[PDB]
Amino acid sequence: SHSMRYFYTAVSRPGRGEPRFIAVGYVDDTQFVQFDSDAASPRGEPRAPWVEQEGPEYWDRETQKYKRQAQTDRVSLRNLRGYYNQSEAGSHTLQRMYGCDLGPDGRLLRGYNQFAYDGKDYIALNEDLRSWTAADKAAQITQRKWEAAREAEQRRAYLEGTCVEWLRRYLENGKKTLQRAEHPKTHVTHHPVSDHEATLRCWALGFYPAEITLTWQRDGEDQTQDTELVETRPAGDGTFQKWAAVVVPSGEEQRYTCHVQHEGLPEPLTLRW
């Protein structure tokens, strides 16, 4: 299963010019496009080789869409500040995430189109792609505005038609990076806490996609209460890293096992110091 997801960020900055609009687009965990309204000559920019060889008409159209979206978000930020009776001096953020999930059959599983204001849910398109859920009164104003405009019909058209077509085209053109799984290379490290304790750290390096599970077991039972788990992090090369760590008594290291689960692994993976 695969997804194409766009992430838009608009940020006001009173007294310091017009709001800045930023967009990034992803297929699964791989970014392919960026736009920044504050750049010298703002244009849609490739971030992946499988869209770099799209023609000039493609890139000109993306660029024009982002430019229009930035303008639209400027008006949205102003309207929202009014709905909430917020003061002129504050900086505010409007975020939009939209896209399409493809099921294992290659068919549309879920389209989504949802918004946040100041980091908090504002309005979202329901899974039926026909109706809206507003999170507060202010958002009810947008809901009636969009219901009157038949906005949802336009978003549905994109989500069921155009969104899937793009994603299927990218999956094919970028199959060498998009349709692959790099399994994690795994190792345990050992760090004396003292003379009586030591940290055991289980590492997963260089995997793709980002989804993974690391778990620490002792003689069989999971070590939920005592596991320190960092968030999965980008290596910088298109792969990801994660670690899981436990503090164990000195001399009892051998009783602990680290369990790694990932799409790319050929078999169950067990590690032990």
């Binding site: 993306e62 309005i123 336009q154």
Partner: peptide, 9 residues
């Protein structure tokens, strides 16, 4: 390919 633009909030 991004969505085309609709109405302001």
């Amino acid at each position: 390919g991004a969505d085309g633009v609709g109405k302001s909030a």
